[PDB]
Amino acid sequence: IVGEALEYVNIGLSHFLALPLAQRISLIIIIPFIYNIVWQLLYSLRKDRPPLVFYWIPWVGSAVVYWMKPYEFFEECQKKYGDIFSFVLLGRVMTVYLGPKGHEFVFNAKLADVSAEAAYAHLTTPVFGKGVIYDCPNSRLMEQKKFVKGALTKEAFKSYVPLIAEEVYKYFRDSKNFRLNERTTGTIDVMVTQPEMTIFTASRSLLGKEMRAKLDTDFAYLYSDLDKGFTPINFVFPNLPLEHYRKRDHAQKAISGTYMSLIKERRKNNDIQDRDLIDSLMKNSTYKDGVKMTDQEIANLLIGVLMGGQHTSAATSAWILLHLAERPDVQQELYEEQMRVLDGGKKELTYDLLQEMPLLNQTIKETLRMHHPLHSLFRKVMKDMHVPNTSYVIPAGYHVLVSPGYTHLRDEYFPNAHQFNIHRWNNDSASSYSVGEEVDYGFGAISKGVSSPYLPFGGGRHRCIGEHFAYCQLGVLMSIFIRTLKWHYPEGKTVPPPDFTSMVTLPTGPAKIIWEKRNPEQKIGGRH
């Protein structure tokens, strides 16, 4: 008889339900804990799964170390397991593929195999609004990218350069961080100045003078609120009934409302020209199946483009200033190139003259090598994927993670990779360039291979379309900083370590530098 054992099964179950509440809470904790450990052990036997990083707390996984020190985590895993490994992250399984083959695996993955919008829509849809970027099918995103790129032409950059320059000068004139007409030296926190200079310059050029004027008002606080809603927390908790989440949603409505008002106002007056991204999207935002973007979708798209451009660029110019603050030799070299190309400062800066400043562009290029603003990009796996030349299968429901910024910092691809050296890019100062064959996913021909160890703008269908804008903006900005100021660290201070916990990787604050006018007597005109 085994029937009597099946009775004690039922009996055991009943005694289980009658345990003292202290013992039940205890078990409510210890049972998932034990089961988690046993599951990992069994998992480690499968030869069709990449090794999985061991973790103690269920669901949470390796969340804490990935959040604080993602590259140190990757290096340690790479040492133990090689280039492919998985780890658990707040309920998700992330399969990391390091190095250029990882780039190809993920960036050039078939559209059916992986989804960016499934990975990202929570990080962005609550902030930007509905119907755009990741809150739409991939083919809509492809065309949105085509639309936005339409305002990012050489001719647009030629007209943006003096607008960006004017904002930089105005910021030197009026901001309390500078006041160059009143002060000849001062101390700044670059994580205060660079986000402000970035939003002022990006607004003026992409959004136009009206939207720029708005930032001189209490309206600016809405950008602050919307900005605070752009946080890694959204990855897990995109909506919680806290005040944080409420100021964000309000801001999105208020800011999209303001863009819609401008859009409808311009159409009303037949005042649609070729000034900015707004004019461009009004004139050119009809999908190929004949559907037009709504005014709300246009406004939402504007928010997304400005927000993304805001954080990558601000972080980058902050890093440029910080690396140059201990490199007066590089400031000196950059200054000589400015003197040569602009004829001792007699020539006004133009987009065409920016292209003749290779060391300036190499400085941007080198900063983006050492400080990729996005340490990890990922996709949700939609169909089981076989890893070439292995036995691994990444099942649907997993996420794949790629990290070009990690490869940027490997000695094998960049000798002395932790040394800042703009000259590693001599005669190679282009922001990026296709090393051969090209393809077009709907927003223009881009490189077909994504095997370059240097990939600051990613690749494949989700590739950045902002790189020439970012270089234009960063170039104007740094050209003027260099011609106007010298700067250095307070005694004993040096380049800060990256903070990886925000949406882009920023310098750990407070990152202060001391500036000095190259020409103490130089005045900036205009009224204030």
Q: Do residues 318 and 507 lie in contact, with contact meaning Cβ atoms separated by under 8 Å? A: yes
Least CB distance to ligand 1YN at residue 17 (A): 32
Output phi, psi for 480, to 5 deg.
Answer: -75, -40
* 89, 374, 400, 511: residue in contact with ligand HEM (rule CB under 6 A): 374
Return the residue matching tokens 């030629």. 158
Binding mask 440-469 for ligand HEM (x = CB under 6 A): ----------------xxx---x-xxx--x
Residue 335 burial (10 A CB sphere; 0-12, 13-18, 19+):
middle
* 377, 450, 482, 506: residue in contact with ligand 1YN (rule CB under 6 A): 377
* CA–CA separation, 497 and 508 (whole Å): 6
* CA–CA separation, 237 and 225 (whole Å): 17
Residue 316 lies near ligand HEM (rule: CB under 6 A)? yes
Parallel, antiparallel, or unpaired for β 485-488 and 512-517? Answer: antiparallel
* 376, 407, 429, 473: residue in contact with ligand 1YN (rule CB under 6 A): 376
Length of the chain, please? 528
469-498 binders of ligand HEM (CB under 6 A): 469-470
Residue 235 lies near ligand 1YN (rule: CB under 6 A)? yes
First to last CA, the chain: 97
Q: Do residues 338 and 163 lie in contact, with contact meaning Cβ atoms separated by under 8 Å? A: no
* CA–CA separation, 137 and 305 (whole Å): 17
Binders of ligand HEM: how many residues, by CB under 6 A? 23
Binding mask 319-358 for ligand HEM (x = CB under 6 A): ----------------------------------------
* 40, 51, 54, 67: residue in contact with ligand 1YN (rule CB under 6 A): 67
Binding residues for heme, as ranges, are 464
Q: Do residues 353 and 341 lie in contact, with contact meaning Cβ atoms separated by under 8 Å? A: yes
Among 248, 277, 252, smallest CA distance to 263 is for 277
Partner from ligand 1YN, ligand HEM, none contacting 316, C-beta within 5 to 8 A by type? ligand HEM
Binding residues, as ranges, are 120, 134, 145, 379, 462, 464
Least CB distance to ligand 1YN at residue 1 (A): 51
Of 225-233, 242-250, 263-271, 368-376: span binding ligand HEM (CB under 6 A): 368-376
Neighbours of 2 (CB within 10 A): 6
Binding residues for heme b, as ranges, are 120, 134, 145, 379, 462, 464
Residue 503 lies near ligand 1YN (rule: CB under 6 A)? yes
Output phi, psi for 488, to 5 deg.
Answer: -160, 175
What does R_g of the chain's alpha carbons equal in angstroms? Answer: 26
Residues whose CB falls within 8 Å of the CB of residue 341, separated by 6 or more in sequence, listed in order: 347, 353, 356, 357
Of 231-239, 333-341, 384-392, 471-479: span binding ligand 1YN (CB under 6 A): 231-239
Interface with ligand 1YN (CB under 6 A): 60, 63-64, 66-67, 90, 120, 124, 133, 232-233, 235, 304-305, 307-308, 312, 374, 376-377, 464, 466, 503
Interface with ligand HEM (CB under 6 A): 116, 141, 145, 148, 305, 308-309, 312-313, 316, 368, 373-374, 377, 456-458, 462, 464-466, 469-470
